[PDB]
Amino acid sequence: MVQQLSLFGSIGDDGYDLLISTLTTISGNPPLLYNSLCTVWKPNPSYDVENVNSRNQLVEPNRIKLSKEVPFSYLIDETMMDKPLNFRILKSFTNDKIPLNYAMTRNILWSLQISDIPAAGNNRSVSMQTIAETIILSSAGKNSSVSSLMNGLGYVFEFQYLTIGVKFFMKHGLILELQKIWQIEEAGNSQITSGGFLLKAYINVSRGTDIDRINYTETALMNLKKELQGYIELSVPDRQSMDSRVAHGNILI
Amino acid sequence: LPKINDKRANLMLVMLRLLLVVIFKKTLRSRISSPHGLINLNVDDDILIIRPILGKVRFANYKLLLKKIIKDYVLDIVPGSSITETEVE
Amino acid sequence: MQPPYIQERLKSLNDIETQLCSMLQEASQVTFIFGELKRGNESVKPQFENHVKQFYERLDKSTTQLRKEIQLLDENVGTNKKALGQDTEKMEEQLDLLSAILDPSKSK
Amino acid sequence: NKLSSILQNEHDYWNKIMQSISNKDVIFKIRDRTSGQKLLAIKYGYEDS
Amino acid sequence: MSNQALYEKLEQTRTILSVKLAELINMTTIADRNDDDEGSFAQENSELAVATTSVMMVNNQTMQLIKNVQDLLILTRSIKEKWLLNQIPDEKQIEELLDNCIETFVAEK
Fold first, then answer.
1. DSSP letters spanning E14-75
2. Are A242 and A129 in contact (CB under 8 A)?
3. C84 in reach of chain E (CB within 8 A)
4. Of the candidates E97, C101, C98, which has an alpha carbon nearest to the alpha carbon of residue B15?
C-alpha cells in the first residue's frame, strides 16, 4: 500500500526525439526500454452481492488490475531484428497494428493491484492516490491458471491493453514515464494514444501518516514541473476520471 | 638503471586504476537499476582494490608452503604418488 | 572541434562585424570629404555620390544579413553527456597502456 | 580614428579567442567569488561518471 | 526575447537614418539662410547661441552614433554567445590480456 503522488501530460510524436534529449540533459541518465500487459477484472454480475451495506455504504465494488511483463520477442516483427533493442524502435510504433494479437494473449492466460479515487478537496497540488498491491508468484493444481484463479475469487475478465514506452530515473525516487497504449480485442488492435505519447511523472510514499515526507515529495514534483515550463505543461488530471468503481464507467486513457 | 620489479610496480598501478574504474561502473549500474536505493558504498563489500592482489599473493605463498609440506611428508615418504593440479570456477 | 554549422554561423557573424567596421570607416571618409566639399573645390564632387551610395548599401545589407541570422535563431530551436561514456574511454586507454607494458618489443 | 583603432584591437583579440578555442565538454558561465563577473568554466570531474 | 531584439534593432536602424538625415541637413544649411519671403523659417537671433546650438548638434550626433554602433556590436556578440552556449546536443582479447598479466605478475612476485 502506497500513496502515489502524480502529475500528468501528453506530447505529440513530432517533438518526441527532441524531448528525449532534453531529459538526458537534466537527469544525466539514458532512457531504458520497457513494456507491460495489464488485464482488468470486475466482479461477476451473475452473483448478487447483497453484502454491500446499502443503508451505510461501508464499501463499494471495485476493479482489479493484474499486470505482467512480456518479452520483446513477441513485439518485434520479422523486419526489426536488424535494429538494436533501444528506444529508437518507438519511432516505428505509430501504426494501430502490433505483432501481439488476441490469440497469443488468450494463450498467456503477475502483480495484483487495487486503487481508490484520489483525495477530495481543491487544496491539493498533485494527484494523491492510494494503492493496495500484492504479488502472485506461482500456483499448482488441476486448474492452475490466472483465469481460473480470478473466477475462484469471484471476478471475470473485462478488457486488456498493452503499454510500451521509456523510463527515466531521477533523484529522490522520482520516476518519469513516456507511454503508448494499445487496446487489444479479437476484432483487432487500436492505439488509443494515437499520434502522441502520454507523459506521467510520479513518486511513491510508503506510509501515508508521515507528512514531512509527503511535503518533500510535493516540493520535488512541483520543482520538476516548474523546470519544464514552456516545453510541456504538466497538470493534475480530473479527479472524476481516475475513478475505477464498477457502478460508474469511465477510463482515463 | 632498470630494476627487476619496475614492471611489477607499473602493473600494480595499472590494475589499481582498472579496479577503480570497475568500482565506478558498478556504482553507475546500481544507480541506473533502481532509484530508491541510496548509493552509500560499504567498505566491507563495495571497496575491493587491495583485496584481490593481496589474496593472489598470499594464496600463491600458501600454495608453495603446502606444496613443500606435501613433498616433505608424502612425496619423500611414499614413492609413486601422483599429483594433479586443477582450478574450479 | 565544433560541428560545421556553428562554424559557418560564426564566420557569418564575423563578416557582420567586419562589415560594421567598414561602414564606420566609410562614414569617416565621407565626413572627411564633405569638409573640403564645403571648402570649395569641385574636383572631388563625383566621388561624393559613390561614397554615399556605397555607405548606404553597406548599412542596409549588413542589417539584412543580421536579420537573417536572428531569423535562423527562430527555426534553429528544436534542432554531463560525455561522462556517460567518459569512464569507458578511460578504461580503454588504461588497457592499451597495459598492452604496451605487456609487450616488451613495443617499448622503444 | 580612435574607434577604428580600438575596435580593430578587439577584433584582434576576438579572432585570437575564436581560433584558440577548441570544443561535448560541459561549458557554462559562472560568477567569480572574488571578481563577481561572468567567466567561462568547464566541468571535468568524474561526478557524473 | 529574440523578437524584442528584432524590435530594438529596428529603432536602432531608424534612429541611425533619422540622425544621419538630421546631421546632413544641419551641416548643409549650417550656412545660415536669409530669405525675404515669409515662407522660409530660419532664425538666427542671438549671435553666439547659434554656435552653441551648432556644437549641440555636433555632440548629439557624435554620442548617438557611437552609442548605437557600440550597442549593435554588443548585440552581435550576445547572439554569438547564445549560439555557443544554449544549443543543447572485443571482450575475449581482454580476457587473455588479463590472464597473461596476472600470470606474469604471479611469476614475477
1. HHHHHHHHHHHHHHHTTS----SSSS------SHHHHHHHHHHHHHHHHHHHHHHHHHHHHH
2. yes
3. no
4. C98
A29, B35: Cβ pair inside 8 Å?
no
Q: Which residues pair with A168 in a beta bridge?
A: A176
**Grid cell listed for C92:** 580503454
The SS3 assignment for C79 reads coil
The DSSP annotation for A19-34 comes to HHHHHHHHH----EEE
User: Helices (H), strands (E): how many in chain D?
Assistant: 1, 2
Cβ separation A173–B32 shorter than 8 A: no
Tell me the three cell numbers of residue A49: 452481492
* Angle between the N-to-C axes of helices B6-33 and B50-70, in degrees from 0 to 180, rounded to the nearest 10: 120
Distance CA A82, CA E104 (A): 42
**How big is the CA angle at B9 (ends B5 and B15), to the nearest 5 degrees?**
135
Query: Which amino acid belongs to residue C31?
Result: T
CA-to-CA distance for E91 and C91, rounded, in angstroms?
13
Alpha carbon distances (Å) from C21 to C34, C57, C66, D1, E19: 20, 14, 14, 11, 19
Helix (H, G, I), strand (E, B) or coil at D34: coil
Question: Which is nearest to C95 in space by CA: E94, E37, D45?
Answer: E94
Supply angle C-alpha B61, B57, B23, rounded to 5: 155
Residues of A in contact with E2 (CB under 8 A): none
Q: Does C78 touch chain A (CB under 8 A)?
A: yes
Q: Which value in Å is the resolution of this experimental model? A: 4.3
Chain CA centroid to CA A86, Å: 21
